[PDB]
């Protein structure tokens, strides 16, 4: 009776955008797997923080399904996500089974690369807007967190807490989100 | 002409409170050393995120001095910091040379353990207030970030961005802090 989250971690990911959702989701009782795109080895993030993944993506793929798939940002991280055929397979399967897909900052650009969720309202980091909107396949929002159907997006490192709590609210409900929020000492 | 920051990473540290300052300080051009209390090996944080330190504290001690020493929170992490004789030596030396000392959430309780900065105004996580105030050696503040002399404290994971930017403002000045802040998409 435990919800499951997959966080996909590639070289160049924004480490704040990775750790904040993982930590908050584990505070909410969610079973989180931090899966390394290239394997089980330690991943050098964009600001040189080095994180050990829980598993390789190959292994984690086989322990599905997941109630949410999480794509952090970071420009080079999103580029690696966008180029990965394994990411494409995971995202297409999540869309087909109507599971949640959550991406933050530059992360949403991987959705475009993999042709995921066309027609949805999305947000990105302002600097990633032009890339996300190539072709007019999505409608753009400037909300700090945006949710349309099964696609949940958010704008930047500074929105990481709101992004994570929205995942909690979607999976476990508003009361659990509010309970997890209070000890964090967030402003609003 | 490059400022230097030491972040001390112990088992049980709050991983958000570790990564956010490290990332933000590196965005500000600060040379940050993430030093592992127990050695060079990977450190399991409070919500099971595993981080590889840049060096052992023993090695990092010898490459001083540092313009700021940073103590993350997490209850078990702060307890390990409070029990460490090496932490005591580093903090006493930083105080004597009038360097900045920054601690967040439960981190400030290590200051009490090591008899650092008595008489200063400090804040902590609300749940750590009683521990920090045993003996009346500090004056308590409910400000989200508090700075008195060379002691800079902050309250919780949700204050980590404000805490980090205050370190930047202290080391590199208000203009660099404002420049680093804008791409983060913080609310205020």
Curated annotation (Swiss-Prot), chains A, B:
Residue ranges that the Swiss-Prot or TrEMBL entry lists as coiled coil: none
User: Impact of altering residue 105 to A?
Assistant: Abolishes enzymatic activity. Abolishes oxidation, association with mitochondria and protease activity. No effect on chaperone activity. Reduces binding to OTUD7B. Removes the glycations and restores histone 3
- Topology in the membrane? Lipid-anchor
Record annotation: effect of changing residue 125 to A: Strongly decreases enzymatic activity
How this protein is processed and modified after translation, per its record?
Sumoylated on Lys-129 by PIAS2 or PIAS4; which is enhanced after ultraviolet irradiation and essential for cell-growth promoting activity and transforming activity.
Q: How is the cofactor bound?
A: Deglycase activity does not require glutathione as a cofactor, however, glycated glutathione constitutes a PARK7 substrate.
Instruction: Tell me the active site.
Output: 105, 125
Reactions catalysed, semicolon-separated, are:
N(omega)-(1-hydroxy-2-oxopropyl)-L-arginyl-[protein] + H2O = lactate + L-arginyl-[protein] + H(+); N(6)-(1-hydroxy-2-oxopropyl)-L-lysyl-[protein] + H2O = lactate + L-lysyl-[protein] + H(+); S-(1-hydroxy-2-oxopropyl)-L-cysteinyl-[protein] + H2O = lactate + L-cysteinyl-[protein] + H(+); N(omega)-(1-hydroxy-2-oxoethyl)-L-arginyl-[protein] + H2O = L-arginyl-[protein] + glycolate + H(+)
Which keywords are on file for this protein? Acetylation, Autophagy, Cell membrane, Chaperone, Copper, Cytoplasm, Disease variant, DNA damage, DNA repair, Endoplasmic reticulum, Fertilization, Hydrolase, Inflammatory response, Isopeptide bond, Lipoprotein, Membrane, Mitochondrion, Neurodegeneration, Nucleus, Oxidation, Palmitate, Parkinson disease, Parkinsonism, Phosphoprotein, Protease, RNA-binding, Stress response, Tumor suppressor, Ubl conjugation, Zymogen
Give all N-acetylalanine modified positions.
Answer: 1
Where Cysteine sulfinic acid (-SO2H) occurs, residue numbers? 105
Q: Does the keyword NADP apply?
A: no
PTM N6-acetyllysine: at which residues? 147
Main function: Multifunctional protein with controversial molecular function which plays an important role in cell protection against oxidative stress and cell death acting as oxidative stress sensor and redox-sensitive chaperone and protease. It is involved in neuroprotective mechanisms like the stabilization of NFE2L2 and PINK1 proteins, male fertility as a positive regulator of androgen signaling pathway as well as cell growth and transformation through, for instance, the modulation of NF-kappa-B signaling pathway.
Q: What is this protein called?
A: Parkinson disease protein 7
- Protein source organism: Homo sapiens (Human)
- Name of the gene: PARK7
């Amino acid at each position: 009776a435990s919800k499951r989250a997959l966080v996909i971690l590639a070289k160049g990911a924004e480490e704040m955008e990775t750790v904040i959702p993982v930590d908050v989701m584990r505070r909410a009782g969610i079973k989180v797997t931090v899966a390394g795109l290239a394997g089980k080895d330690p991943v050098q993030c964009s600001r040189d923080v080095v994180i050990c993944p829980d598993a390789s993506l190959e292994d984690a793929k086989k322990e599905g399904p997941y109630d949410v798939v999480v794509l952090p940002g970071g420009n080079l991280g999103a580029q690696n996500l966008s180029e990965s055929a394994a990411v494409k397979e995971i995202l297409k399967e999540q869309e087909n089974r109507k599971g949640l897909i959550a991406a933050i900052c530059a992360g949403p650009t991987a959705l475009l690369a993999h042709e995921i969720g066309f027609g949805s309202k999305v947000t990105t980091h302002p600097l990633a807007k032009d890339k996300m909107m190539n072709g007019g396949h999505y409608t753009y929002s400037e909300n700090r967190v945006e949710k349309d159907g099964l696609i949940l997006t958010s704008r930047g490192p500074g929105t990481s807490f709101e992004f994570a709590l929205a995942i909690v609210e979607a999976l476990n409900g508003k009361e659990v989100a509010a309970q997890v929020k209070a000890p964090l000492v967030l402003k609003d």
